Amino acid sequence: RDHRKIGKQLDLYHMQEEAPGMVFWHNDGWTIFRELEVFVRSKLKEYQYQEVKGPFMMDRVLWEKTGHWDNYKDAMFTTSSENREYCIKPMNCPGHVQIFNQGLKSYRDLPLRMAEFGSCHRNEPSGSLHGLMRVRGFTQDDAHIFCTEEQIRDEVNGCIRLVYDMYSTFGFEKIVVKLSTRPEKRIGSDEMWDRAEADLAVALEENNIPFEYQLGEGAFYGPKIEFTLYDCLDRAWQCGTVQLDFSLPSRLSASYVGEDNERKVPVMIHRAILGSMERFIGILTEEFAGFFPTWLAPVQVVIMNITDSQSEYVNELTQKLSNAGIRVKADLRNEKIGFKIREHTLRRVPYMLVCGDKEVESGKVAVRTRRGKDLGSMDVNEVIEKLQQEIRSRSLKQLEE
Amino acid sequence: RDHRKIGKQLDLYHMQEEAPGMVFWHNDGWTIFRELEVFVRSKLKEYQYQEVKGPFMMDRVLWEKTGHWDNYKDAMFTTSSENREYCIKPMNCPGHVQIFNQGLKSYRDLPLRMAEFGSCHRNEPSGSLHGLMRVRGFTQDDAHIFCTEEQIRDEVNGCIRLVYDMYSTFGFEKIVVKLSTRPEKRIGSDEMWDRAEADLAVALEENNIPFEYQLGEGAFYGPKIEFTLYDCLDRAWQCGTVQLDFSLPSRLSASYVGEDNERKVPVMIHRAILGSMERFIGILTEEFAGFFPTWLAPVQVVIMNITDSQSEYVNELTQKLSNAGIRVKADLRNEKIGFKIREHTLRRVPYMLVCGDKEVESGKVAVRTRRGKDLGSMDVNEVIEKLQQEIRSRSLKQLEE
Ligand SMILES: C[C@@H]1C[C@H](C)C[C@H](C)[C@@H](O)CC(=O)O[C@H]([C@@H]2CCC[C@H]2C(=O)O)C/C=C/C=C(\C#N)[C@H](O)[C@@H](C)C1
Ligand SMILES: C[C@@H]1C[C@H](C)C[C@H](C)[C@@H](O)CC(=O)O[C@H]([C@@H]2CCC[C@H]2C(=O)O)C/C=C/C=C(\C#N)[C@H](O)[C@@H](C)C1
Ligand SMILES: [Zn+2]
Ligand SMILES: [Zn+2]
Structure with a gap:
């Protein structure tokens, strides 16, 4: 500390x-x-x-x-x-x-x-x-x-x-x-x-x-x-x-x-x-x-693609959350998913969203946190809702905390 | 100039x-x-x-x-x-x-x-x-x-x-x-x-x-x-x-x-x-x-009363408009209504909301502008919506044109 x-x-x-x-x-x-x-x-x-x-x-x-x-x-x-x-x-x-x-x-x-x-x-x-x-x-x-x-x-x-x-x-x-x-x-x-x-x-x-x-x-x-x-x-x-x-x-x-x-x-x-x-x-x-509440977090959400196949989709989502007032970055880099997950875990990013082919098809996002909790596949608007509520309330705790 | x-x-x-x-x-x-x-x-x-x-x-x-x-x-x-x-x-x-x-x-x-x-x-x-x-x-x-x-x-x-x-x-x-x-x-x-x-x-x-x-x-x-x-x-x-x-x-x-x-x-x-x-x-x-577009205006709305009878109502409205993100002042002093309108017109306040008894009973406001226009009687929530839109869009122009 x-x-x-x-x-x-x-x-x-x-x-x-x-x-x-x-x-x-x-x-x-x-x-x-x-x-x-x-x-x-x-x-x-x-x-x-x-x-x-x-x-x-x-x-x-x-x-x-x-x-x-x-x-x-x-x-x-x-x-x-x-x-x-x-x-x-x-x-x-x-x-x-x-x-x-x-x-x-x-x-x-x-x-x-x-x-x-x-x-x-x-x-x-x-x-x-x-x-x-x-x-x-x-x-x-x-x-x-x-x-x-x-x-x-x-x-x-x-x-x-x-x-x-x-x-x-x-x-x-x-x-x-x-x-x-x-x-x-x-x-x-x-x-x-x-x-x-x-x-x-x-x-x-x-x-x-x-x-x-x-x-x-x-x-x-x-x-x-x-x-x-x-x-x-x-x-x-x-x-x-x-x-x-x-x-x-x-x-x-x-x-x-x-x-x-x-x-x-x-x-x-x-x-x-x-x-x-x-x-x-x-x-x-x-x-x-180093773990800031979501409202204080410099980068609140990072959206990652498994392959280039998800890129478009990722970008799409990244705009959506960006227009919802959420601070969000896309990692489109050519790297393994674990590399990205690790990097954004060390950065204490509250929410890591993963998009594979399943999510592209379903219109969902795989949701996990910096504490290593898998929130699983969730509806995008649901995620946006919960994030916005967490931000407006300036909560000290994340989803499922 | x-x-x-x-x-x-x-x-x-x-x-x-x-x-x-x-x-x-x-x-x-x-x-x-x-x-x-x-x-x-x-x-x-x-x-x-x-x-x-x-x-x-x-x-x-x-x-x-x-x-x-x-x-x-x-x-x-x-x-x-x-x-x-x-x-x-x-x-x-x-x-x-x-x-x-x-x-x-x-x-x-x-x-x-x-x-x-x-x-x-x-x-x-x-x-x-x-x-x-x-x-x-x-x-x-x-x-x-x-x-x-x-x-x-x-x-x-x-x-x-x-x-x-x-x-x-x-x-x-x-x-x-x-x-x-x-x-x-x-x-x-x-x-x-x-x-x-x-x-x-x-x-x-x-x-x-x-x-x-x-x-x-x-x-x-x-x-x-x-x-x-x-x-x-x-x-x-x-x-x-x-x-x-x-x-x-x-x-x-x-x-x-x-x-x-x-x-x-x-x-x-x-x-x-x-x-x-x-x-x-x-x-x-x-x-x-001196006439700043409403988004730039230091005081966007001044809500005023005729007599003490409207004071409460005015206050309500003020809080309401303050809750809607609008910059708003209440003018409660005992003065002619025209006195207030002229003072705030010379202060380049975009909107002046006049409340008499009829506005209180009808739950409305009498809308005026610094340009000297009378926009007539209006529903409060309608005014709030229009003002919010005018501000969000950063419009150079006010209502009714
Ligand atoms: C010129 C004088 C300096 C003073 C004697 C320094 C002391 C160490 C201490 O009194 C400072 C202090 O407590 O200021 C504190 C401030 C408030 C937040 C933290 C502290 C801060 O900013 O540090 C407030 C007082 C300001 C005082 C003045 C001013 N202006 C006085 O009129 C003037 C007599 C101050
Ligand atoms: C130290 C030098 C001063 C330079 C000769 C002053 C000139 C009158 C003019 O070139 C300044 C200029 O155009 O700066 C302009 C700024 C941009 C907005 C208006 C002007 C502003 O800020 O006024 C930007 C340039 C910055 C340049 C440097 C820096 N740092 C250079 O590396 C360095 C060689 C500048
Ligand atoms: Zn420069
Ligand atoms: Zn001081």
Whole structure:
């Protein structure tokens, strides 16, 4: 269960010294990534998030305003144009605030949930870089919630439900949660922190989640909730976070018109479920030992011919399944059937369909799996039905599992 | 007819001086972008392209070997880590070759068509920066085809068909193709050039396209054809290109095992249809003067009510249309109905569904368009079917005509 070895065996990705900590996504790994993107977007539509795109770099003055220049300085890449210095974005938050600042905002626009798949580049020490898990470039599932003080609790709640939904989808039911509270010195009033902390704690309690306090471990800009999933090996992976920010909105001059027609500064919530999506792909790759659920599988079905006599037929089927929204390849190569079966078994292809003369005559397909289960001769439309159902339900288990 | 004014009016995007030439995509504009992306991906599936993702930056040595350091130096952003120089990629081609170089290749792996939506950063003089059309950051619809000299003609044919298909989708049927031939000094033998040029010419006239010749205007690394579409104002936009490259594979050491069991260097084809996708979004914004075909429209349907009495009903409908894959908003505020219709008409929302008491009792909707047409009372499911068809087909035209 090493995501790098499995990564090479399935031709998911590769890395080079000319770009340390930056992934080359091959077709299949990128298919996995894009499927993750699809799932996340379904969740964004369900939980009602906007999806935006921020610029890759912004000038140094912005990053000084946000405080990244004081705190994040070593971790940022800098480039320059026309005697102006720019940092490549380590985070998507300031850009999101810049978007929020366009147009007048009122209380009616709140809560405003703004999501992006962030392309972030942090310059990490090269000695710390490991696989997909510790990288210089990465893509965050990143959202920011602009709300009022009264809307905090509910929004945190929605974030919690989102976390558990999304995690249970991949089969992680074991989640340890940590609430980090105020340090000795902080931005924001004692009252603001009391409200925020009470909101987090109470939300977690109402969702029936046992959690542990980490005292003084909260950032100076706000209290937070962190989510650690456990894999099938009982290894701990910290992914999800809900973080309050009392710093960013005032520094970037975010404001809205309240009910009283008075200028208010919105509360900000950083929320991420998977965190780094590259890293999450590493984690999934190791959890699944290379066998991905059908919806996550780069190639879902491979259709093979015994001889050239089946070729036409195979092609025919390959179109049909392709038009059904299934990811399917045909192996027409001149090879023995066992060669193909072996090759596609090592590739962890969920479904191998075999066409001999029997299938050409009958209008059926011989169905077998990567687990060595023979499902036997099946009607094509039946196969398409079951595959489509398995894909739409994002099931962890195959037919007859 | 200014994509900047229309962009501001429709809340599509904005730009700042902290990121010159770099777009902040708001929710709506990003929705347009995502629809473009989806369409292109449909064409990638149809024309059988891989989709990959390359790294954002790479070592300066790489860009020296590609020839960018000599030719592209002023256009590239440079950043550094641990006493090593990296360039942010102006182009996606070297990364694609790097991916290609992973694993042994044979002729049986060819043609290999590799696509990406490239995030490319070139450093353009700030004074030449205009809107979405001239930008520092951009996303290219980019592909590279690795093939044998024998497959060149077929691949160019495929690219041509792709170009005309995609352009036809957006309503540009007026296209001028220009074939740029060999410069006095060039990379590659006169034979390679005779064959490539003849392949471009013959593919073009196989497609019945009266191409114009540009003599000696080709690059030193290969011959090309370029595609210029004309809009409704009959102004020319050069977008697509098919560009042969003899320089890149040799410089980057790409090779495959021939059918003769000998070492072969793959022929490389750079191909793009839209070119910059931001720029193409601008061009489309001006072409449609803000009225995006329903498939491209950020908000496809706005369901509105007369009084509170219809609110519930409206909500139902909204959810329904949201469940049918339609992008739909509910306008519940207390305002004149005409107020709402005018506001959403100026927002270029394709369809406005008006619900009064009669619609509630009859289970229907009163259908209106941004063009000012009254489509009358309609069955809800009928509207859903027609909208779904209009979207699936990517029709340039709305209902009732
Ligand atoms: C410039 C400051 C850097 C900060 C002190 C770095 C710490 C190590 C830590 O606080 C980072 C953090 O938890 O950010 C977390 C993010 C969320 C997902 C994972 C983590 C992530 O992206 O790593 C969210 C907070 C962002 C905070 C800001 C912004 N923007 C603040 O306004 C600003 C004061 C941050
Ligand atoms: C480093 C060299 C720069 C070249 C001299 C710049 C010229 C102005 C022009 O030839 C660029 C060009 O046509 O690139 C075109 C692209 C395609 C879409 C529009 C254009 C685009 O991206 O702008 C593709 C060519 C890429 C070529 C290489 C690469 N990699 C070559 O191996 C290498 C020798 C190019
Ligand atoms: Zn953030
Ligand atoms: Zn290229």
